[PDB]
Design an enzyme around this catalytic site. Structure first.
Site, short mmCIF file in Angstrom:
data_model
loop_
_atom_site.label_atom_id
_atom_site.label_comp_id
_atom_site.label_asym_id
_atom_site.label_seq_id
_atom_site.Cartn_x
_atom_site.Cartn_y
_atom_site.Cartn_z
N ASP A 1 0.85 -1.20 0.00
CA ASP A 1 0.00 0.00 0.00
C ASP A 1 0.89 1.25 0.00
O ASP A 1 2.09 1.18 -0.30
CB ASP A 1 -0.98 -0.06 1.19
CG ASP A 1 -2.28 0.65 0.91
OD1 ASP A 1 -3.32 -0.01 0.70
OD2 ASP A 1 -2.28 1.89 0.89
N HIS B 1 -4.32 5.79 3.55
CA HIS B 1 -4.97 4.54 3.17
C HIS B 1 -4.21 3.33 3.68
O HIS B 1 -4.81 2.36 4.16
CB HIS B 1 -5.12 4.50 1.65
CG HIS B 1 -6.43 5.03 1.13
ND1 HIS B 1 -6.72 6.38 1.09
CD2 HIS B 1 -7.52 4.40 0.63
CE1 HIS B 1 -7.94 6.55 0.60
NE2 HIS B 1 -8.44 5.37 0.31
N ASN C 1 -12.37 0.31 -8.63
CA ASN C 1 -13.40 1.30 -8.33
C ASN C 1 -14.11 1.83 -9.56
O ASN C 1 -15.10 2.57 -9.42
CB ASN C 1 -12.78 2.50 -7.61
CG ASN C 1 -12.64 2.28 -6.14
OD1 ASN C 1 -13.05 1.24 -5.61
ND2 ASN C 1 -12.04 3.24 -5.46
N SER D 1 -10.70 -0.72 -2.01
CA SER D 1 -9.54 -0.68 -1.12
C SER D 1 -9.93 -0.94 0.33
O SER D 1 -9.06 -1.29 1.13
CB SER D 1 -8.82 0.68 -1.22
OG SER D 1 -9.51 1.72 -0.55
#
Ligand code: CA
Ligand code: CA
Ligand code: CA
Ligand code: CA
Lengths: 7, 290, 290, 7
Positions: free
Chosen positions: B31, B68, B160, B227
């Site tokens: 990430d 995130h 997404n 995510s």
């Protein structure tokens, strides 16, 4: 040349 | 300071009861990094490695400029032992792989490939990725391939870029590769998220709408995207692995754990292109015993 | 027609309802051979090769001098018309590989390996074996590994050396190889059959006691042993491969189909050492819609 | 020599 991002 | 309603919805507490909280599982987290000093995470992190540009490519610097990455971390395996929040596998260990630099949170494929190859050489059980890329690059596919044949469960957010029509497809990579455990997102009413990528490579879906987890600097907050779905599955894999290595009295292989994963799924009525096998629900077999 | 007790019990007809009867699935029955002219089976076969010594290595002669191959082949895909009985997957096709010779149903690991590779070469969907031997010959694990590599489902009966006692392991190969879908045996009432080998490599169980299916020369009869249980699974993957491939609208891989095997399983209150994941129960995720 | 019987 090739990219990713979080999602 | 309890259990994000999301994590109760996927039924992880009912597995903690039987003593399945993730212990013995290492999960590499590919990430934007992770603030490693956050109380809810400090003793969960076992290592950190930078492959992005930030900090002159100091490989040991993994500071999360976006949020995130720490957020994903907490969802997988945040512990409450400091009065904080809980993750799906709070006795498991995270390895932090920073493959997205800068604050808008975006990294180069070779960095993603770097971290995937690393994660496997470190023999993690679970690679967790919440990134997407629009192009199918063959070096990527092979890295994904090599890790999986190595025994690693490779989980990715599905993408997404979705619209709501199950007839129109979107492809995000690495999710779109058959080997990946591609995770779509749902409402907490479990309806398919409008932004959930549809294609024929969705495996299952998890909560991905307005998810509470940890943010850098001893903080918290909600977020949104596939995510957020992926870390629900990533963490859940670790406790499934716990439940099944006990029941079978041996270590379980990659495909076996996948079977076990889709065995802990109830189906939905929407199309398999949006929801995959269904909703991540870890008490599904018991429900079968009634 | 009066489809056998055991086949109704595994819920096959409830998938015949949906159109999933085996269309396009090809199963290689490695066994004692088969009487290819039994009314309930003559149509269903697409070829046969013999690797035994009977008929002096006349490879085109797969005739069944023991009765088990025909009984097994019948349990997989016997046909409803010409009178007679229904297999699990009556719309699928069978290949008769004869690697077990004589009436005692014996053959060498040479002939088993030969046929496995011969079925792999012929690019079939499933390999149903109901054989077993106490030696662990790497070349056999080689053959199965290569066949699963290419994407065959490899099914094998678990072994008849059980002693009712889950604390004691009995090993039979190729069932014992992790790669092989090992099938143990229960009863009418889903109770572990005493002879079913117990080990950490049982995947699931199926009816294995008093199974009536086709015997050579237009005859029928009942048999007992894990050899009766595996063909229930073999014919099931045919049905299952058709079901899920519609639902997903693509072709599934060998790890995906396996996952979909274990999903259609029913948790049992007995040790995984004897029953693995439980009872082959094909409506099981519909039981989850509730 | 291996050998294996129906089971
Ligand atoms: Ca869409
Ligand atoms: Ca997949
Ligand atoms: Ca025993
Ligand atoms: Ca197996």
């Amino acid at each position: 040349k090739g990219e990713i991002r979080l999602i």
